[PDB]
């Protein structure tokens, strides 16, 4: 994070992580769609022609004011397909909080676990520890018929009873819940 | 995140370096961005232009070049140049976590830009050479949205 | 498959460009970030990472150009110490990456990159 005392601005970086097609970019598109002009910048989306994220999405968001400092949250999503790993590592630099977006389809459970170990690895390799940073997990795609139960995703993905949110990103369900949860964990960390 | 703070002591000098370069090198815009994407300062005709997006693409570009330089066994390319027919753009790494960016009209020779940039960068490392949370409570946080 | 025919002909263009410009290595990268072809000294280089960082760099540069009222910047030249790196967009979808040591001039690489581009733009057609 970066605090400009002169301009009274608190800046925090939040990165959405998870496997390919799991819904990271849909989270940001929803947030952008529903936020008044006066609290958001422009949504940058570096994507392929089939809309897969190729480098990152970026959305700057202002969440109000705490003790007369404006809060600016810099939201990123990574490219989730395995072979973008080199680009994916770049986005984690200076991350203040992480949202891990998991796809609830049984056919993507192993992609979820692979992506989660990839987030642990990538953080360790630049000197962070997922067990020690503000972290929430989103079980996205709860609408789909082939979605596994919340309890089986907890067993596969969530060992420290990290805050977990059910979402259906395209309708917005769970999206602002997830953002509010990691944003407050980040702000609680600074308070310490 | 490394908890980083900037008091108006060093902010005011950094802004001064920037508006020097836009006036002298006839830059259309100037700005300073952390490697992690955080915009630190801008300067120039930043009306009608999104310096927050610019800072984010810049740090993404520099980080991708960073990894490529490392892949072909080199160090981070100290700067990058990108000519345009109308407006052109030059950037250089200032220190270990900062990037200075200048885009200018091509009615301003490249030689004059890399001149003022030799000094402004050297000036910036001279500046780098030099609490809201204490009274905060969890209602301040919970009441944010 | 006539894909077998095209893909050896793509390697041909890359191989000719590596010799005719005295380069170290040549990569042909889709804007998708997937490697299309590679000629030259590739043994000690992760080619998945290189394709991914190359597509990411071009995408970032593009989004930036689009902000400051300029079309996508066509070429990037990033001179290093013992080596150099040149990049060009061939047509719409492909990025050509030429890494060459400093005993080679950028002006020859660009001269040779012109004809490789057309040889590639017509292989695609
Ligand atoms: N049914 C259903 N579809 C969803 C849900 N969330 C996202 N999708 C769909 O899945 C597809 C992928 O979403 P997207 O946000 O682009 O994935 P991503 O995580 O950003 O993917 P990538 O950039 O790593 S490849 C889109 O078609 C999107 O509409 C969901 O909650 N329920
Ligand atoms: Mg995406």
SS3 for A142-177, per residue? CCCCCECCHHHHHHHHCCCCCCEEECEHHHCECHHH
Give yes or no for C63 touching B (CB within 8 A). yes
Q: Which two tokens stand for residue C68?
A: 């400051």
From the CB of A158, is ligand 1 less than 6 Å away?
no
CA distance A176 to A167: 10
CA distance C54 to A86: 10
Nearest ligand to residue A88 Cα: 1
Task: Tell me if A146 is assigned to a ligand binding site.
Answer: no
- In CATH, A1-192 is 3.30.1380.10: no
Residue with CA nearest ligand 1 atom 11:
A21
Show Cβ contacts of residue B88 under 8 Å, excluding neighbours closer than 6 positions: B81, B82, B103, B104, B106, B110
Q: Give DSSP secondary structure letters for chain A.
A: -EEETTTTEEEEEEEEE-STTSSHHHHHHHHHHHS-GGGB---EEEE-TTS-EEEEEEEEEEEEEETTEEEEEEEEE---SGGGHHHHHHHTTT-SEEEEEEE-BGGGHHHHHHHHHHHHHHHHHTT--GGGS-EEEEEE-TTSTTBPPHHHHHHHH-SS---EEE-BGGGTBTHHHHHHHHHHHHHHHHH-
Look at B52 and A60 and tell me if their CB atoms are within 8 Å. Answer: yes
Which residues in C lie closer than 8 A to residue A84 (C-beta atoms)?
33, 52, 56
Q: Are A41 and B50 in contact, with CB atoms under 8 Å apart? A: yes
Nearest atom in ligand 1 to the alpha carbon of residue A167 is 31
Q: Are C105 and C84 in contact, with CB atoms under 8 Å apart? A: no
From the CB of A22, is ligand 1 less than 6 Å away?
yes
Nearest atom in ligand 1 to the alpha carbon of residue A26 is 15
Enumerate the domain spans of chain B.
1-145
Give the DSSP H or E segment for B67. Answer: helix B51-71
Strands A135-140 and A164-166, how do they pair?
parallel
Look at A13 and B56 and tell me if their CB atoms are within 8 Å. Answer: no
Q: Given A4, A41, A63, which is nearest B145 (Cβ)?
A: A63
CA distance C91 to C118: 9
Method: X-ray
Q: How far is B129 from chain C (nearest CA, A)?
A: 27
Q: How far is the CA of A64 from the centre of ligand 1 (A)?
A: 29
- In CATH, C3-124 is 3.30.450.30: yes
CA distance A1 to A11: 6
* Backbone angle region of C60, left / alpha / beta, with phi > 0 → left and psi within -120 to 50 → alpha: alpha
DSSP β-bridge partners for residue B79: B92
Which of A46, A49, A57, A79 should one mutate to test binding to chain C, selecting the residue with the greatest count of C CBs within 10 A?
A46
Write the DSSP symbol of residue B114. Answer: H
Chain C from 12 to 31: CB within 8 A of any B CB: none
Q: Are B102 and B21 in contact, with CB atoms under 8 Å apart? A: yes
Which residues in A lie closer than 8 A to residue B36 (C-beta atoms)?
13, 93-94
Q: For tokens 């890399």, what's the residue?
A: B114
Task: Give φ, ψ of A112 to 5 degrees.
Answer: -60, -55
- Name the closest residue on chain A to residue C59, using Cα atoms: A46
Task: Give φ, ψ of B38 to 5 degrees.
Answer: -75, 120
Q: How far is the CA of A55 from the centre of ligand 2 (A)?
A: 9
Q: Are A90 and B67 in contact, with CB atoms under 8 Å apart? A: yes
Give the DSSP H or E segment for C111. Answer: helix C106-124
Look at C83 and B61 and tell me if their CB atoms are within 8 Å. Answer: no
Q: For tokens 């402004």, what's the residue?
A: B120
Q: Which two tokens stand for residue B114?
A: 């890399």
CA distance B71 to B39: 27
Enumerate the domain spans of chain A.
1-192
Length of chain A equals 192
From the CB of A25, is ligand 1 less than 6 Å away?
yes
Look at C59 and A55 and tell me if their CB atoms are within 8 Å. Answer: yes
- C-alpha dist (Å) from residue A188 to A133, A180, A181, A184, C78: 11, 12, 11, 6, 42
- Name the closest residue on chain C to residue B57, using Cα atoms: C60
Look at B7 and A44 and tell me if their CB atoms are within 8 Å. Answer: no
From the CB of A51, is ligand 1 less than 6 Å away?
yes
Q: How far is the CA of A108 from the centre of ligand 1 (A)?
A: 12
């Amino acid at each position: 994070s970066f605090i400009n005392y002169s301009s009274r601005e608190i800046n925090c970086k939040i990165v959405y992580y998870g496997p390919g097609l799991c819904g990271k970019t849909t989270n940001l598109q929803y947030i952008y769609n529903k936020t008044a002009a006066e609290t958001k910048g422009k949504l940058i989306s570096l994507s392929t022609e089939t809309d897969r994220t190729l480098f990152f999405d970026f959305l700057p968001l202002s969440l109000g004011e705490i003790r007369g400092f404006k809060t600016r949250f810099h939201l990123y999503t990574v490219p989730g397909q395995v072979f973008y790993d080199a680009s994916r590592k770049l986005i984690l630099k200076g991350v203040d909080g992480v949202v891990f977006v998991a796809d609830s389809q049984i056919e993507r459970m192993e992609a979820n676990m692979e992506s989660l170990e990839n987030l642990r690895i990538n953080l360790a390799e630049q000197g962070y520890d997922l067990n020690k940073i503000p972290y929430v997990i989103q079980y996205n795609k709860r609408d789909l018929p082939n979605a596994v139960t919340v309890e089986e995703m907890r067993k596969a993905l969530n060992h420290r009873n990290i805050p977990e949110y059910q979402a259906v990103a395209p309708t917005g369900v769970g999206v602002f819940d997830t953002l509010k949860a990691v944003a407050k964990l980040v702000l609680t960390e600074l308070k310490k | 995140g490394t908890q980083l703070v900037m008091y108006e002591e060093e902010f005011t000098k950094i802004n001064a370096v920037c508006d020097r370069l836009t006036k002298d090198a006839n830059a259309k815009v100037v700005f300073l961005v952390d490697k992690n994407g955080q915009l630190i300062s801008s300067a120039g005709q930043t009306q009608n232009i999104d310096t927050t997006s610019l800072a984010s693409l810049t740090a993404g570009n520099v980080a991708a070049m960073g990894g490529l330089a490392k892949l072909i066994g080199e160090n981070e390319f100290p700067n990058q140049f990108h000519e345009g027919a109308k407006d052109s753009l030059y950037m250089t790494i200032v220190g270990s976590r900062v990037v200075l960016v200048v885009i200018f009209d091509n009615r301003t020779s490249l030689g004059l830009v890399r001149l003022r940039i030799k000094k402004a960068s050297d000036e910036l490392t001279k500046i780098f050479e030099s609490s809201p949370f204490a009274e905060m409570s969890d209602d301040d946080i919970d009441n944010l949205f």
